[PDB]
Amino acid sequence: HKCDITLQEIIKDLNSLTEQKTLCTELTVTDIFAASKNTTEKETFCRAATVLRQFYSHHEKDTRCLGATAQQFHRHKQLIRFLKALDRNLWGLAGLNSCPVKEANQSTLENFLERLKTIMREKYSKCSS
């Protein structure tokens, strides 16, 4: 369960997400990593899955993000697609729907995805030889 290949799928989604910039990636999420580390692994995933769901829900049809050019619109849809795929995997890992996220600090979506990627790669590393 813990060292399941879902970890690789999350890492994969994150790899695409962070190699991708859009009009929208500087917009903010609640910084669940500004906490003092007071949560189980399942709580962490639930928290991350929560803030990302707020983000894609709010920005999928947001005029600042939707794009003027074909390429901008494409990148916007890609981003929302990948966020939903990552979110889906996170919820499957979490095993939890209800986790309050209490941080004030906002970070750009971009910085948040890079942090989550570092934590995911650390989980993968702790799983293998």
Residue numbers in the entry: 1 to 129
Manuscript text:
Interleukin 4 (IL-4) is a pleiotropic cytokine that plays a major regulatory role in the immune system. Signal transduction of IL-4 is mediated by a sequential binding process, initiated first by binding of IL-4 to its high-affinity single membrane spanning receptor chain IL-4Rα. The overall structure of IL-4 comprises the known four-helical bundle in up-up-down-down topology, which like the crystal packing is unaffected by these mutations.
In contrast, the affinity of the IL-4 variant T13D-R85A is decreased 6.5-fold and its dissociation rate reflects IL-4 wild-type-like binding kinetics. Since the hallmark of the super-agonistic variants was a clearly decreased dissociation rate constant (relative koff (T13D or F82D) = 0.3 – 0.4 koff (IL-4wt)), this confirms the above mechanism by which Arg85 is involved in generating the higher binding affinity. To exclude the possibility that structural changes in addition to the removal of the Arg85 side chain play a role in the changes in binding stability, we determined the structures of the IL-4 variants R85A, T13D-R85A and F82D-R85A. No changes in the local structure around residues Thr/Asp13, Phe/Asp82 or Arg85 could be observed (data not shown).
